[PDB]
A paper describes a structure:
The [name] (HA) protein of the influenza virus is responsible for receptor engagement and is, therefore, one of the major targets for studying the virus-neutralizing mechanism and screening neutralizing antibodies (nAbs) against the virus. After binding to the host cell receptor and being internalized into the endosome, the HA protein of the influenza virus is cleaved into HA1 and HA2, which are covalently linked by a disulfide bond. Subsequently, it undergoes a low-pH-induced, irreversible conformational change that is required for viral entry through membrane fusion. We resolved the cryo-electron microscopy (cryo-EM) structures of [name] [name] (HA) alone and in complex with the nAb antigen-binding fragments (Fabs) and identified the HA head-located epitope for each nAb, thereby revealing the molecular basis and key residues that determine the differences in these nAbs in neutralizing [name] viruses.
In the HA-Fab complexes, the densities that are responsible for the HA trimer and the Fab of the nAbs are clearly defined, revealing that all the Fabs bind to the head domain of HA but target different sites. The [name] binding site is located on the top of HA, and the BSAs defined by the H and L chains are 770.1 Å2 and 451.8 Å2, respectively. We then conducted HA conformational change inhibition analyses and found that only [name] inhibited low pH-induced (pH = 5.0) HA1 disassociation. We found a unique R140K mutation in the HA of SD193, which is likely responsible for its strong binding affinity to [name]. The R140K mutation is located in the 130-loop, the core component of the [name] epitope. We found that the HA/R140K mutation in the 130-loop pushes the up edge of the 130-loop closer to the L chain of the Fab, which leads to the formation of an additional hydrogen bond between HA G144 and [name] S30L.
Author numbering:
A (entry chain B): 1 to 117
B (entry chain A): 52 to 317, 328 to 347
C (entry chain C): 1 to 109
D (entry chain A): 398 to 446
E (entry chain A): 200 to 248
F (entry chain A): 299 to 317, 328 to 347
G (entry chain A): 52 to 100
């Protein structure tokens, strides 16, 4: 399953940018879709607030009152808007539809978002 | 069953792992038989205890919920096999990250067989509302079990209690019955201990609570808690809960039935009548 | 959060070899006869990909010449013959017990 | 831990049924004893006459 | 006599002929010169007879 | 009142002896076929 | 018991203050016997009775 992100790459710290990952092949079903942050100097963290197939929300620890992940069913792409931006958060955002006991294999190549003023 | 009990044959605590999917024409429950290893009881458990010891066995199928954004191995230090283990046929669906959240899951299972299922599922009565922020996540917890017949929408009781051998959190958990071509949805966003092996039935059996040992060489059908009543006699003063194909309980310990005539030793009037004496020297006839 | 130790957190290796490198677990990671520890390959210039689930039961889609191994606490995969396209960064993340946390990483060239 | 009311109902029912059968068992045997001595004294008449 | 304070179960289920929402509903008995109050701010299917 | 014996036949006549007192199956050793007016 | 009832012997409403901690080989409940003074009943009260 090949799948592509989309989102504007020129954005300021402190304003909102949206992420849009097209889920090819099938819709948001009993397998929902998560997200992963890439940091500088090649380290990861599972920042991805994800939306299940019933419309709820599960943030990271540091990022609870911080974002919103909800599902849209018409475009096979979950809805998210990333406000509050900071130049430390420059990274490539890899969407991933999960299966959780194979792995997050339905994975993305990332649209490189550079967050700087 | 030994350390296993009746209601453990569905749930499979580590004292029941050799009885998970059994077959019987007689189950035998023991006084030491814990139905539980992370402590508690069932809900309407005397109703469920009269089905499972009339089932014959417990045949199973996988349900195959592909749990996602989840964990599977909720293990605790009172269900040991080698180390941290759990019930063989349930899963603590606890969250991805510690205090983050645990979203809604809607999980369906269509019964597709000839027989009525006997499902079971779990709600987690934790000790406090600080464990159910690190196990599952902030917010209220709903487990909604709506079949075609039912609608229940359960909720836990996160209060402290005196300890049964190590922990101040409980679990108590519930059960329905399906009919062929039904479905069961499990809507839940926390505190839910799903099944993974839907349970079926096998036919005829009976079931006894007792405390004495097993004689596989003798045969009988009247099995109370202190043995087996084997005779052809219609009344017993042994136990008033003698289940099986038993005789009928009374309270007179001696009901002597006059399988011979009167003694007159040395309603018609010759037995204790004008024939005034019995005889000692007849053993061939009456 | 679980801090899984990678040691060595830097190596690169030769052809046709077998490597035993550990992301080691510091918490209670015994259950079910197994651990829920998946791995992923990450090639520099490619998106990552699953390779192992449920240590014995590998996927199809990679050649099966990777061998995730272990029974106990600290786990370690094994490789047999290494080829040219092994030059990648072999992360993983944790899924077995709460919480999720990624690897070190370690290198492979 | 059987339920308090229905356990009293079952004990009301069982001890009724216990008083049903034990009255029946005491009456049956005493009826059968009187009948057995009736059919023991009867074939005195059937033999002696 | 009563005090119950009911609450619904908004969960999904397999369908009985068309819908995935249920209703299940309750009943009391009055005695002469009593009253019944119905306090409700949603999800309530009142009687009219 | 429900029972489980499908046939509980209750002896609305006397014994047949065809060709607790002892004359029904007793010294009166034979029944009679040709009486329909009385017992 | 009089104005006291059965389930008031635990709870002690003011009609039961001379029966709070009683001793009996026979208790006798009355038709006028309120088990309550700030009104209500128990839950599964026939089991406790
Ligand atoms: C029922 O009676 C038995 C003995 O006859 C007793 O052991 C049991 O506790 C009783 N149960 C209740 C609920 O009264």
């Amino acid at each position: 399953v090949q799948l592509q992100e989309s989102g504007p790459e020129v954005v300021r710290p402190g304003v909102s940018v949206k992420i849009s990952c097209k889920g090819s092949g099938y819709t948001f079903t009993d397998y929902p879709m998560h997200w992963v942050k890439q940091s500088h100097a090649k380290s990861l963290e599972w920042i991805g607030v994800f939306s299940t197939y019933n419309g709820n929300t599960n943030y990271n620890q540091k990022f609870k009152g911080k974002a919103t992940m909800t599902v849209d069913k018409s475009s096979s792409t979950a809805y998210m808007e990333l406000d509050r931006l900071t130049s430390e958060d420059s990274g490539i955002y890899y969407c991933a539809i999960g299966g959780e006991l194979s792995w997050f294999a339905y994975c993305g190549q990332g649209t490189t978002l550079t967050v700087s003023a | 069953l030994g350390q296993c009990g009746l209601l453990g044959t569905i749930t499979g605590p580590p004292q029941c792992d050799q009885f998970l999917e059994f077959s019987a024409d007689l189950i035998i429950e023991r006084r030491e038989g814990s139905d539980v290893c992370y402590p508690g009881k069932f809900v309407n458990e005397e109703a469920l205890r009269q089905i499972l010891r009339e089932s014959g066995g417990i045949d199973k199928e996988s349900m195959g919920f592909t749990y996602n954004g989840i964990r599977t191995n909720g293990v605790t230090s009172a269900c040991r096999r080698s180390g941290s283990s759990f019930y063989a046929e349930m899963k603590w669906l606890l969250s991805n990250t510690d205090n983050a959240a645990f979203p809604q899951m809607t999980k369906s299972y269509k019964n597709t067989r000839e027989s009525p299922a006997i499902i079971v599922w779990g709600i987690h009565h934790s000790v406090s509302t600080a464990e159910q922020t690190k196990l599952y996540g902030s917010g209220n917890k709903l487990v909604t079990v709506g079949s075609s017949n039912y609608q229940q929408s359960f909720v836990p009781s996160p209060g402290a209690r005196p300890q049964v051998n190590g922990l101040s959190g409980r679990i108590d958990f519930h059960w329905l019955i399906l009919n062929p071509n039904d479905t069961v949805t499990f809507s839940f966003n926390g505190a839910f201990i799903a099944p993974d092996r839907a349970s079926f039935l096998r036919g005829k059996s009976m079931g006894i609570q007792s405390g004495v040992q097993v004689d596989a060489n003798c045969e009988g059908d009247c099995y109370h808690s202190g043995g087996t009543i084997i005779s052809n006699l219609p009344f017993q003063n042994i136990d008033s809960r003698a289940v099986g194909k038993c005789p009928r309980y009374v309270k007179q310990r001696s009901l002597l039935l006059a399988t011979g005539m009167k003694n007159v030793p040395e309603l018609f009037g010759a037995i204790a009548g004008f024939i005034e004496n019995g005889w000692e020297g007849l053993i061939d006839g009456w | 959060d679980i801090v899984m130790t990678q040691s060595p957190a830097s190596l690169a290796v030769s052809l046709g070899q077998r490597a035993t490198i550990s992301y080691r677990a510091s918490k209670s990671v015994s259950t079910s006869g197994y651990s829920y520890m998946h791995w992923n390959q990450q090639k520099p210039g490619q998106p990552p990909r699953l390779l192992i689930y449920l240590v014995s039961n590998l996927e199809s889609g990679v050649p099966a010449r990777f061998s995730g191994s272990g029974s106990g606490t600290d786990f370690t995969l094994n490789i047999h013959p290494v080829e040219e396209e092994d030059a990648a960064t072999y992360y993983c993340q944790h899924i077995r017990e709460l919480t999720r946390s990624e690897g070190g990483p370690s290198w492979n060239s | 831990e059987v339920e308090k009311q229905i356990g009293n109902v079952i004990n009301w029912t069982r001890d009724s049924i216990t008083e049903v059968w034990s009255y029946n068992a005491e009456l049956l045997v005493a009826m059968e004893n009187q009948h057995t001595i009736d059919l023991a004294d009867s074939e005195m008449d059937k033999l002696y006459e």
